[PDB]
Amino acid sequence: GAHLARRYLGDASVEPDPLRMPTFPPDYGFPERKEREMVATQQEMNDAQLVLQQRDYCAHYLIRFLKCKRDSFPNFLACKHERHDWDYCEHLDYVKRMKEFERERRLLQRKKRREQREADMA
Amino acid sequence: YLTHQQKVLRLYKRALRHLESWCIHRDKYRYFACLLRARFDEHKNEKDMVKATQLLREAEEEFWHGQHPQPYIFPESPGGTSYERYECYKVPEWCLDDWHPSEKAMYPDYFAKREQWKKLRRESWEREVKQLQEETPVGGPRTEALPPARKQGDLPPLWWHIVTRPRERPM
Amino acid sequence: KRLFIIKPSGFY
Amino acid sequence: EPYPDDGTGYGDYPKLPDRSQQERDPWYDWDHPDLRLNWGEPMHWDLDMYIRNRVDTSPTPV
Amino acid sequence: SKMELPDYKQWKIEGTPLETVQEKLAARGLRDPWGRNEAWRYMGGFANNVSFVGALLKGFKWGFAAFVVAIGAEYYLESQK
Amino acid sequence: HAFFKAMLFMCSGSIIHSLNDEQDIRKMGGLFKAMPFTTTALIVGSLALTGMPFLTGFYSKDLIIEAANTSYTNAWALLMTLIATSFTAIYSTRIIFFALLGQPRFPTLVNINENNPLLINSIKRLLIGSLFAGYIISNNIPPTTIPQMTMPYYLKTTALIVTIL
Amino acid sequence: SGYTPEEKLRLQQLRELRRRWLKDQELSPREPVLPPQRVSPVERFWNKFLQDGALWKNVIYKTYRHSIFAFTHVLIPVWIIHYYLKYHVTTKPYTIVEKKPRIFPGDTILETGEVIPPMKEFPDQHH
Amino acid sequence: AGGGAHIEPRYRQFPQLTRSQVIQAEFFSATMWFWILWRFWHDSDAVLGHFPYPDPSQWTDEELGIPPDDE
Amino acid sequence: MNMFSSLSLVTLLLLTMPIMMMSFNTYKPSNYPLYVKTAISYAFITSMIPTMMFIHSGQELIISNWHWLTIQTLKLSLSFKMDYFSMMFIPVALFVTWSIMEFSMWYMYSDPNINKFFKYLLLFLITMLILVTANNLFQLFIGWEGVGIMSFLLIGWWYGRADANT
Amino acid sequence: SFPKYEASRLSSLPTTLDPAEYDISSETRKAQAERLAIRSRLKREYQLQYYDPSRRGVIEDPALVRWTYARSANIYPNFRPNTKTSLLGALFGIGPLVFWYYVFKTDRDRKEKLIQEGKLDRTFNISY
Amino acid sequence: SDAPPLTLEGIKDRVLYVLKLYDKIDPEKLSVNSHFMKDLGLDSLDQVEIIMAMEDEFGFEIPDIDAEKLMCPQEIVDYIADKKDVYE
Ligand SMILES: CCCCCCCCCCCCCCCCCC(=O)OC[C@H](COP(=O)([O-])OCC(O)COP(=O)([O-])OC[C@@H](COC(=O)CCCCCCCCCCCCCCCCC)OC(=O)CCCCCCCCCCCCCCCCC)OC(=O)CCCCCCCCCCCCCCCCC
Ligand SMILES: CCCCCCCCCCCCCCCCCC(=O)OC[C@H](COP(=O)([O-])OCC[N+](C)(C)C)OC(=O)CCCCCCCCCCCCCCCCC
Ligand SMILES: C[C@H](CCC(=O)O)[C@H]1CC[C@H]2[C@@H]3[C@H](O)C[C@@H]4C[C@H](O)CC[C@]4(C)[C@H]3C[C@H](O)[C@]12C
Ligand SMILES: *C(=O)CCCCCCCCCCCCC
Structure with a gap:
């Protein structure tokens, strides 16, 4: 990616650190934020035997897709819509992570930007 | 050893074989095979032996620098894929003397005729020894070449293990 | 052409 | 040419060239085609290390 | 068997890349x-x-011919619904 | 990999047997027309190994290359993997060019016969597998990970660009 | 650069002996003289039956041999394996351990007729 | 090796090709290309991309919660 | 489970039958390559039944049928793991091994020891199925080392060749 | 132009690049044919027995009986306890034994200290 | 190995067939007993290529010790027939 060219071959203080992110508290902006809404419950995922890395906020669609696949057998070409639903939810989840990287990316600009004024001036 | 004539011919054969490996395509090989022949022609009839050696000795250095790292080798030649592939099927003839009579009963004609060869080998041996005991110098043989048969009805001395040797595709 | 195959004795 | 008399036990066994049996001529009619040896020929002290299944010393292109 | 070999006079380098090598x-x-x-x-x-x-x-020629029929047929059947 | 790789050796064996135990591609050539069925299987196998889309080898190799790119991974190990994908096309093309195309380089008397029903059926079944096996397996096995289906255009198609080049 | 007259003569004499030896390696029509074999009556029925390579006849042979194989190598073994697993291997604790079957929201359990509540409403995604 | 058809080897000439040999090879080559085109027609997002990839720059500082510099 | 277990073991047992028949000589020669090829074919169809039962509902199980040895607090029993990486590899290996055995009937037709060749190809397949289905390391070590030995005996098939032994 | 070939104990000098091959003199010629006399003299003694039709057994090879004797029974009587053999036998014979002793005594001394202190994980270790 | 066995006539036909395609040999005077050096005026450098063409014809190498000893197409047939166990 282009970010790798910046954190290594250039200034590294303004680039996010993937292992340490996030740094700023979640409420720096956003006068009010909403907690993520987990549709599935622990017993539902537990009884569906989802792999622990599959028990994310998209799990509710995954549960429905697996149920359709079992019922649609032997038709493996079926449950095409259910798969896309789960894929799209994982696509939205990935974008939120991309937004989180940008939020940390820009908030680190603030420190490098609201610190020359308080250093150059005095 | 190898006389200067033999060493030049060997280098020419090696040079063309390795060259054939680089070229691959026949038409391209037929081009550089002629050019390489010309280089062996500009000095075809050199007179000074010392100069001839210096030409041969320099060709080898150019051959070593230019040889293909992975030259083509015929399948059954030393270092080839099929080399010694059938040496496990090559059984000697003396193993047939240990056969049970029941097995020999399956090939009555083959073993009847095999008995004739054994008689032929057994009758001609004492003559073969003499044929070599008289043509050999006083000290001993100075070369590995054997002489042919001189009298009608005699067999070439030391013929059994070159005549009865197993076939190249025994099975 | 159905040659004779020389093999060691297999009877024993 | 025997080995140097250094007291390691070589005695008078000949010091033959340290060449593998892969360097021998493969077209000569050896008495032992696989070993590339002749009956009566003196054997290298390390012959069993130089058989064609083991250490090779043939010239390399590089 | 006794393989009968072809007449040896037909093998001419004319009209082949071998001729081009003979020119050079x-x-x-x-x-x-x-x-x-x-x-x-x-x-x-x-x-x-x-x-x-x-x-x-x-096999692209026949493969493409089969492909155009398939998608054309798929449109027709899906025309009903 | 089991389907199309086993096919390549069997196609290699057909050529070797025809040319009287000649395993060197320098003494092959002009077999595209002489061995049509062995040629078809070799081409199909060389397209699954290189990653031709939708054949058997596409449903595993390209997911790997996509997941290797979008991972917190060693950078140099990623570059070597991509270069190795370029080399896969080069040596697969090497077999096709030096064994199928061009003019013959094998001896004058050769029996290029590949009509034995055992040879056709064995290669034929793997030929079917090296076309549809990846599609069938991928659509039947249950998911066990969160596949990465969102990424920059130049990371999704890196396998194709590398292979085509 | 060629054979000396002595060498040529020896090669010819070796060649004439070698060819005759190779000739003697040919088998006569009688050979091999197999001893009598007790031919099974069943195989006799098929020797005559397969006298003419009819397409329909060999199919019956094809079905016959496959049917026998499916009885001596699939049916008999599975009977033994099932008996072994049914009454010897599954009668001991923790021998065959089956991963519990997956339960999804809205499934009915056969053992007790229980019903699993459906999941909460999915708000909306559309796309 | 053993079975099939007995083809006479030809000396310095093109080998003899049977009929079913050439039909089957052409059919499977065709079957390959039909499969690739049919799969490409229906599933082209498996090789070019399924979902759009956002451009982080175009995201507004309001939705990322970046409070203004002064405050 | 009654069918999943029985048909998952019949596959392994089916492949060992040709080995057993070639020991007590309860078979006829010159059909052995065909006999072994047919065993793989039936082993492939039977192995597909447990695979389908997995594809249907994701059914897996572990079979610990024979108690072999108990070293104090370590109990070693012959255990077979029929799971994701056993219901998908066995069908693939048998399908590929089916073709290679059929191709071998033609490629190795003139080999005098074609019967031993098909016994070694079969023994390797058994040691690979032992390795793939192993539920404990010791049993995994049996097929892990067995495949190496059968590789050794097949690489040096033409044992008269020095480069084959090396 | 053409870099010279540099040999090694595991890469012998090619016969086509060895000066002694192209420097053919009178003494070398006599030596080469003088060797071939021995090769033929031995080759004849072997052949008179190999081709013998009444022979059944093993042709004893005096060269093979000299090689095994030279490698087993002739070693000790031709050994002298000098500086070369004493240092080689000291560092190859005793050296490894002392080296491994300290590798294991140190390893077991360190392990025993942890076990006594109770800071070595042996939670499930009940097989020794 | 499924290939047709060689015949004495076949070896002679193919050995001469290759020589007939050698420009420096006149097909009219070419015979089984035609010595290369003393009946066709070919230098040894040309005889090496003759042998190299024979080994590319039957697909097996002839060692240089014996290649430089064959000076006649009849001898080549004997050498090839002896190294392939051809007796009729
Ligand atoms: C109490 C009532 C019951 C009575 C009890 C009485 C008990 C008394 C003892 C009776 C024992 C009977 C012995 C046989 C009698 C003679 C039969 C006969 O006529 O011979 C004809 C037989 C065939 O005739 P031929 O072709 O003319 O032979 C001449 C050639 O020279 C032949 O040379 P070749 O190159 O063709 O082959 C040589 C070698 C084979 O060549 C090789 O490949 C050597 C390398 C093979 C080993 C590589 C794999 C290593 C891994 C072992 C895997 C097994 C453990 C797996 C455990 C977990 C899964 C179960 O021979 C073999 O060993 C064949 C078997 C290979 C092992 C088979 C393993 C898989 C079998 C299936 C196991 C599952 C069974 C479940 C059944 C259901 C439960 C009951 O000739 C011979 O084989 C002569 C040698 C006989 C030796 C027998 C000993 C076999 C030992 C097996 C190999 C060692 C494996 C090491 C692991 C040991 C684990 C136990
Ligand atoms: C963990 C270490 C265990 C110690 C043992 C392993 C170390 C090597 C010492 C054992 C090898 C010597 C055995 C004697 C030789 C017997 C066989 C023989 O004669 O060879 C002839 C053969 C020659 O075969 P060839 O194919 O090379 O050439 C023969 C000639 N042709 C090809 C023309 C036919 O050589 C071998 O097969 C042996 C090669 C292996 C030896 C080298 C091992 C290298 C190990 C990897 C090094 C990098 C470390 C990687 C990480 C692994 C280590 C943790
Ligand atoms: C059915 C199968 C091949 C048939 C085919 O594909 O054409 C044939 C080929 C050789 C046969 C086997 C061998 O003849 C050895 C056994 C002979 C007896 O008929 C018992 C079963 C036996 C084990 C046979 C089962 C089956 O009929 C076999 C395996
Ligand atoms: C970045 O995501 C890491 C990608 C590492 C694999 C190389 C892919 C090519 C990247 C080119 C940089 C493009 C920047 C616009």
Whole structure:
């Protein structure tokens, strides 16, 4: 990616650190934020035997897709819509992570930007 | 050893074989095979032996620098894929003397005729020894070449293990 | 052409 | 040419060239085609290390 | 059996890349005696062999013909619904 | 990999047997027309190994290359993997060019016969597998990970660009 | 650069002996003289039956041999394996351990007729 | 090796090709290309991309919660 | 489970039958390559039944049928793991091994020891199925080392060749 | 132009690049044919027995009986306890034994200290 | 190995067939007993290529010790027939 060219071959203080992110508290902006809404419950995922890395906020669609696949057998070409639903939810989840990287990316600009004024001036 | 004539011919054969490996395509090989022949022609009839050696000795250095790292080798030649592939099927003839009579009963004609060869080998041996005991110098043989048969009805001395040797595709 | 195959004795 | 008399036990066994049996001529009619040896020929002290299944010393292109 | 070999007079380097090699050798005073030995490799069924792009496209003509029918049929059946 | 790789050796064996135990591609050539069925299987196998889309080898190799790119991974190990994908096309093309195309380089008397029903059926079944096996397996096995289906255009198609080049 | 007259003569004499030896390696029509074999009556029925390579006849042979194989190599073994697993291997604790079957929201359990509540409403995604 | 058809080897000539040999090879080559085109027609997002990839720059500082510099 | 277990073991047992028949000589020669090829074919169809039962509902199980040895607090029993990486590899290996055995009937037709060749190809397949289905390391070590030995005996098939032994 | 070939104990000098091959003199010629006399003299003694039709057994090879004797029974009587053999036998014979002793005594001393202190994980270790 | 066995006539036909395609040999005077050096005026450098063409014809190498000893197409047939166990 282009970010790798910046954190290594250039200034590294303004680039996010993937292992340490996030740094700023979640409420720096956003006068009010909403907690993520987990549709599935622990017993539902537990009884569906989802792999622990599959028990994310998209799990509710995954549960429905697996149920359709079992019922649609032997038709493996079926449950095409259910798969896309789960894929799209994982696509939205990935974008939120991309937004989180940008939020940390820009908030680190603030420190490098609201610190020359308080250093150059005095 | 190898006389200067033999060493030049060997280098020419090696040079063309390795060259054939680089070229691959026949038409391209037929081009550089002629050019390489010309280089062996500009000095075809050199007179000074010392100069001839210096030409041969320099060709080898150019051959070593230019040889293909992975030259083509015929399948059954030393270092080839099929080399010694059938040496496990090559059984000697003396193993047939240990056969049970029941097995020999399956090939009555083959073993009847095999008995004739054994008689032929057994009758001609004492003559073969003499044929070599008289043509050999006083000290001993100075070369590995054997002489042919001189009298009608005699067999070439030391013929059994070159005549009865197993076939190249025994099975 | 159905040659004779020389093999060691297999009877024993 | 025997080995140097250094007291390691070589005695008078000949010091033959340290060449593998892969360097021998493969077209000569050896008495032992696989070993590339002749009956009566003196054997290298390390012959069993130089058989064609083991250490090779043939010239390399590089 | 007794394989009957073809007449040996048909093997000519004419009209083959072997001739082009003989032209370039004629510009240096050298000749190629063995050209006719390699001639059979450029004549008969071994002449005008396919190219690499033509090898990877083997069966494309019939494959494409079957493909156009399939999608055309798919449109028709889906026309009903 | 089991389907199309086993096919390549069997196609290699057909060529070797025809040319009287000649395993060197320098003494092959002009077999595209002489061995049409062995040629078809070799081409199909060389397209699954290289990653031709939708054949058997596409449903595993390209997911790997996509997941290797979008991972917190060693950078140099990623570059070597991509270069190795370029080399896969080069040596697969090497077999096709030096064994199928061009003019013959094998001896004058050769029996190029590949009509034995055992040879056709064995290669034929793997030929079917090296076309549809990846599609069938991928659509039947249950998911066990969160596949990465969102990424920059130049990371999704890196396998194709590398292979085509 | 060629054979000396002595060498040529020896090669010819070796060649004439070698060819005759190779000739003697040919088998006569009688050979091999197999001893009598007790031919099974069943195989006799098929020797005559397969006298003419009829397409329909060999199919019956094809079905016959496959049917026998499916009885001596699939049916008999599975009977033994099932008996072994049914009454010897599954009668001991923790021998065959089956991963519990997956339960999804809205499934009915056969053992007790229980019903799993459906999941909460999915708000909306559309796309 | 053993079975099939007995083809006479030809000396310095093109080998003899049977009929079913050439039909089957052409059919499977065709079957390959039909499969690739049919799969490409229906599933082209498996090789070019399924979902759009956002451009982080175009995201507004309001939705990322980046409070203004002064405050 | 009654069918999943029985048909998952019949596959392994089916492949060992040709080995057993070639020990007590309860078979006829010159059909052995065909006999072994047919065993793989039936082993492939039977192995597809447990695979389908997995594809249907994701059914897996572990079979610990024979108690072999108990070293104090370590109990070693012959255990077979029929799971994701056993219901998908066995069908693939048998399908590929089916073709290679058929191709071998033609490629190795003139080999005098074609019967031993098909016994070694079969023994390797058994040691690979032992390795793939192993539920404990010791049993995994049996097929892990067995495949190496059968590789050794097949690489040096033409044992008269020095380069084959090396 | 053409870099010279540099040999090694595992890469012998090619016969086509060895000066002694192209420097053919009178003494070398006599030596080469003088060797071939021995090769033929031995080759004849072997052949008179190999081709013998009444022979059944093993042709004893005096060269093979000299090689095994030279490698087993002739070693000790031709050994002298000098500086070369004493240092080689000291560092190859005793050296490894002392080296491994300290590798294991140190390893077990360190392990025993942890076990006594109770800071070595042996939670499930009940097989020794 | 499924290939047709060689015949004495076949070896002679193919040995001469290759020489007939050698420009420096006149097909009219070419015979089984035609010595290369003393009946066709070919230098040894040309005889090496003759042998190299024979080994490319039957697909097996002829060692240089014996290649430089064959000076006649009849001898080549004997050498090839002896190294392929051809007896009729
Ligand atoms: C109490 C009532 C019951 C009575 C009890 C009485 C008990 C008394 C003892 C009776 C024992 C009977 C012995 C046989 C009698 C003679 C039969 C006969 O006529 O011979 C004809 C037989 C065939 O005739 P031929 O072709 O003319 O032979 C001449 C050639 O020279 C032949 O040379 P070749 O190159 O063709 O082959 C040589 C070698 C084979 O060549 C090789 O490949 C050597 C390398 C093979 C080993 C590589 C794999 C290593 C891994 C072992 C895997 C097994 C453990 C797996 C455990 C977990 C899964 C179960 O021979 C073999 O060993 C064949 C078997 C290979 C092992 C088979 C393993 C898989 C079998 C299936 C196991 C599952 C069974 C479940 C059944 C259901 C439960 C009951 O000739 C011979 O084989 C002569 C040698 C006989 C030796 C027998 C000993 C076999 C030992 C097996 C190999 C060692 C494996 C090491 C692991 C040991 C684990 C136990
Ligand atoms: C963990 C270490 C265990 C110690 C043992 C392993 C170390 C090597 C010492 C054992 C090898 C010597 C055995 C005697 C030789 C017997 C066989 C023989 O004669 O060879 C002839 C053969 C020659 O075969 P060839 O194919 O090379 O050439 C023969 C000639 N042709 C090809 C023309 C036919 O050589 C071998 O097969 C042996 C090669 C292996 C030896 C080298 C091992 C290298 C190990 C990897 C090093 C990098 C470390 C990687 C990480 C792994 C280590 C943790
Ligand atoms: C059915 C199968 C091949 C048939 C085919 O594909 O044409 C044939 C080929 C050789 C046969 C086997 C061998 O003849 C050895 C056994 C002979 C007896 O008929 C018992 C079953 C036996 C084990 C046979 C089962 C089956 O009929 C076999 C395996
Ligand atoms: C970045 O995501 C890491 C990608 C590492 C694999 C190389 C892919 C090519 C990247 C080119 C940089 C493009 C920047 C616009």
